[PDB]
Protein: Maltodextrin glucosidase
Organism: Klebsiella grimontii
Amino acid sequence: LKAWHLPVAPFIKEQQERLMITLWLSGDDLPPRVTLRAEEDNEELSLPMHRLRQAPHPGVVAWRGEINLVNGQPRRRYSFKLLWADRQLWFTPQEFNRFPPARLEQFAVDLPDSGPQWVADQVFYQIFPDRFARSQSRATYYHHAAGHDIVRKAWDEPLTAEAGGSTFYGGDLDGISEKLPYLKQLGVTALYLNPVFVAPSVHKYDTEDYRRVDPQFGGDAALLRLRHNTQKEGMRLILDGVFNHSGDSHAWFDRHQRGSGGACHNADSPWRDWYNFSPEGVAHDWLGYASLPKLDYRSSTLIDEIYGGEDSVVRHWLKAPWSMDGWRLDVVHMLGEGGGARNNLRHIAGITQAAKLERPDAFVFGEHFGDARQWLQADVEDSAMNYRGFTFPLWGFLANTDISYDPQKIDAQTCMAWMDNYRAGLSHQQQLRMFNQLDSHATARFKSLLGKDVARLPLAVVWLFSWPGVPCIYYGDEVGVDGNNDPFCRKPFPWDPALQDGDLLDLYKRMSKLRKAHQALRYGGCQVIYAEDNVVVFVRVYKQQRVLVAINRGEACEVVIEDSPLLDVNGWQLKEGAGALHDGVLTLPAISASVWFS
Amino acid sequence: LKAWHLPVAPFIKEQQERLMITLWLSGDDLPPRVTLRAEEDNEELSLPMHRLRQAPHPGVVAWRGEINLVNGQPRRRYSFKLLWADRQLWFTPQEFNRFPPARLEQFAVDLPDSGPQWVADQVFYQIFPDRFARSQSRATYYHHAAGHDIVRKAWDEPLTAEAGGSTFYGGDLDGISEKLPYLKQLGVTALYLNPVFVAPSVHKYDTEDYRRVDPQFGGDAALLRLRHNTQKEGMRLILDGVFNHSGDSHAWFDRHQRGSGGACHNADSPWRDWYNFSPEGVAHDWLGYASLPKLDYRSSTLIDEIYGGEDSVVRHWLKAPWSMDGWRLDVVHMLGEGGGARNNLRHIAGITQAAKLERPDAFVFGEHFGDARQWLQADVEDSAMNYRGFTFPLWGFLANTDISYDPQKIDAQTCMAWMDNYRAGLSHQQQLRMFNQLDSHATARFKSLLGKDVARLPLAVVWLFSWPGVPCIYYGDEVGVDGNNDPFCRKPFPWDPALQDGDLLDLYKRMSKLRKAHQALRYGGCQVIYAEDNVVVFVRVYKQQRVLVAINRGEACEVVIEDSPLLDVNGWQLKEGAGALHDGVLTLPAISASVWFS
């Protein structure tokens, strides 16, 4: 017995106020009855399915059911219950289940979809502003929390482990504006910036002013110019939102007493209850870093300040003149009340809600190195940096390592089971906007982690653009900068072409062009078709189009592909890689990734 | 490689403000390092474990870690990461995982435990008041929604399919008080009543007055007497809370215009927005039943009425003079705003919160025929009627059927995988108070569903008292009444001993005595030890005590039990059943359930 279904056309269709669901079956002992188990207002329905007269493909029987859309919540959960005279079987996103699947791991489709529908059409690019580009028409000071002065470096000076948070290479926002032709050439349609608000450090998560741009990055006018320039090029712009904590130099806290009335040294401070202090007066902070005092969201006036009121921080940067396209939420998982994560989901949902109030298509997504499913399944944020669902599976399959840099020996079965299990908890519209990356400012460069297996790096690039979700390039990855974690993952961008991997850059260019050309790589479902040892083969499915991806991490080999109704096409046109498909046989060169259209 | 851990002593220990975690391992290629992956304020920690010098059992190595309890939220999630030089492995509630488990499916322990700690010490009994017992010192009317008069029946009159919701056999609350010696003899320490508030029907989910007891059941004084009588016997008392909808005869709605100002026929009614009406004025209801108009919890005045204020319905019955022990929430999953389940979790959490405000140890648990995990993992209710986790697994394994009465052919592997997978999403303190039952007023009697396999009924009884959770007896099950779903599952209780299965009653009596005698059956962890085909063997573990349960649904057979450090005891004392254990060999008679102590 075999089955096929994906939460997208050709399997689902919306007519009037109904959602038609179609299931494909093949085998010698097919069920005479099939139930479409759909959920309406958390009540499980037993919707009868009927056999379609026309076979969609040779040897395949089609069953069809309807979901009434006039009632119930937008997220449409459903699964298939195959019925024999003496037994039953479930078909789910994770194949066949002999016992009922988790309610939150069925197929799911958001109708109507109130999410930011533009995210799926994007190719993101993360910029650590100080290390990207100095402007054409471009000063030390004492970093109190660091204990020494900041140090200015020449753009070609090697990056040392000393004074990591106080070393500035001078990149600014106008330098980003001046390099927009490069980014547009690469295929980038959206930018995510690390913190750019007034802050003493170089990374600037130690926020000192949530209402002004740091002058070193060019100040308010540089960001307003970048917003106008990105709008002209039709490019989206996301700012880094640091709301779990402030900087200890912020006026609300002011450990260094740069003014008066700060909560650190004044018990009668107006913001004394915006932080959590010991009976002896030491402030709670983020993971022991005294420069990042944790904000206490039990305060109803802090809530009003951050997202509650019309004049709040979250909404301030989403309206004119700023009109940013949303927030990337830093430490989204620990934000809460009383020095910890109490009521975390309630405040994250309130942050997102305030964002959509000012900007209905605002995009709010948080940094989750862990399991983000409880946040996403409660709709407290639009998406999440998909470390559990994409990044760390690739770190293990390709780089033999994980989040803690512990050894990892996983094959294709474990990797796709890992990857398919995570998606199973998400609706299709959620999967299409999951924020996928290979590395960031908070990790070692993925090129470094590959070690002796750098040759696999193109495979992860092809994978980054073909797995469900939106791709994000960490600045410099496309030209091949490497290095270990903070501070060495933030090298200055090598603008000298002799210091650039031009072949890696062209691969990034081709993949974004393929994603822009084919709807399946932006809206299509995803069926893993082969996952054994060194080889992974999946297909994207949208309407009548298909995109086949075949990734081989090891030596050259052949893989026979069983006949599948998903793969019944006029023919395949190789668009990328050196693979070859003929009569269901996959000839894959060593360390290869290949893509097919039609 | 083998591993053992359960979220209870002897594996966990609380000293000062630390939680010591101990892991057992055995095998030829053990990991030189083990990480205790514990979560603190949603941040995953890598707590190093150290090898203990003393082997807890022959061939077993013990690793130990600490969890700092002074910080973080009460629920302590954790799992084990085995570390080799080239690979890693996870040990979880669901054995070994080659890829990281779901954050919500790790081991979990609530420290401190703010839940109702008395629930684990209970043996529940559900009473459909009209069908239980007529009082010693004991009248028709027109049922508007039914269209005919109510019909009174003699206690020995057969139960027909006619006028199901209007047929009264006359049982009342004083009849429950008079039969407390019987219930106490059975082992019952807590009562859950079907609705007893003023309502025209016999089941009385069509609530007409949330502030008075229906006179047919004896009125206010009968309930107040029952509360005093249960308190005297030290018996807990739970009332049925119907808050998703009211009865259409309620004053707030008043379809039959028994007064004036009702929302059904008055657009200017004060409660017009407590329900959802069409543009042409037909009210939203529960699954098409016009007699159950759905309440719209978007109304801030309805919220104040149900649970918001001090004088609200939820809190009214939890304070003097009533002082009930909590609420069983009817249709907990659909309660929400705007005719559906919008913001369902927020209002359920608010209902529970209001209950604990009036009564800190109040017990709030809802009727979940489906997957309740999202409700429980968000702590919006203390527990749930465990149909997905216990009932329906037993319906399939023993009665070859499920919730929709569709055929089911599942073996011991699928059943325990089903049962263990569900518990995995719950903390140990949550598992101990899961509300387990075999049937209810809303299902066919489990004795009937067994069909030709009635002989398995004792096995489910032993199982009902030995699986983690609190057991609930549907009235009459202990004496063997059968019948199909509503209206035939609500037969009058047979008080004539000639109409009673005395052997089934004694088995219920013995199981409650065993549960009262042994802490492991009330507080102990649970490890499934054998689950193949017809045989299930699990063990309850508390401190140094063990309770072994061996259930055989099929023909007589022998099963060899591998040596386990969990089973290394002085010896086993058979306490129930005809099984025999000798030299790790289990001699199980056909259709048998056996229990061992020590």
Q: What stands out?
A: Chain B touches chain A through 56 residues (CB under 8 Å). The first strand of chain B starts at residue 2 and ends at 4.
